Symmetry: C2
């Protein structure tokens, strides 16, 4: 998998070749929706954690008991 990016204000553009990642994750999703399988857990825990905790923030969208909610904001920091 290759993530490529050209600089801003440049006529030449570079594309990203993510096709084997697309193929493998498409395979995982297709086999899961046919007959339920265990999925890999990708997580990033950056310095973006150590935020203060407030119990009152409870309202959210996504139905937390949904299994595919486990991938909800799994990367990107805290």
């Amino acid at each position: 998998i290759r993530l490529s990016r050209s600089a801003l204000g440049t006529a030449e553009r570079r594309d990203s070749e993510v096709k084997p990642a697309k193929d493998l994750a498409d395979i995982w999703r297709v086999i899961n929706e046919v007959n339920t399988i265990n999925l890999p857990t990708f997580a990033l825990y950056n310095v973006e954690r150590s935020q203060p905790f407030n119990r009152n923030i409870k309202d959210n969208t996504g139905r937390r008991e949904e299994r595919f909610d486990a991938y909800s904001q799994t990367l990107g920091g805290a």
Copy 2:
């Protein structure tokens, strides 16, 4: 009790005499801090009470197990 107000842009502004209502609503508070009594309730229920209800928590204002919270938005309709 008399509530008075003149028009917009009027040079002379009429005052509102609320002194005996202030005294009668002050005697209740001053005796209530000493020895607990039964305070009266004042409520307004206009057409706005037909608002739809959604399962959300305000969790910002003051602590809904508190007697003077019963006067919170009591005459603002609904």
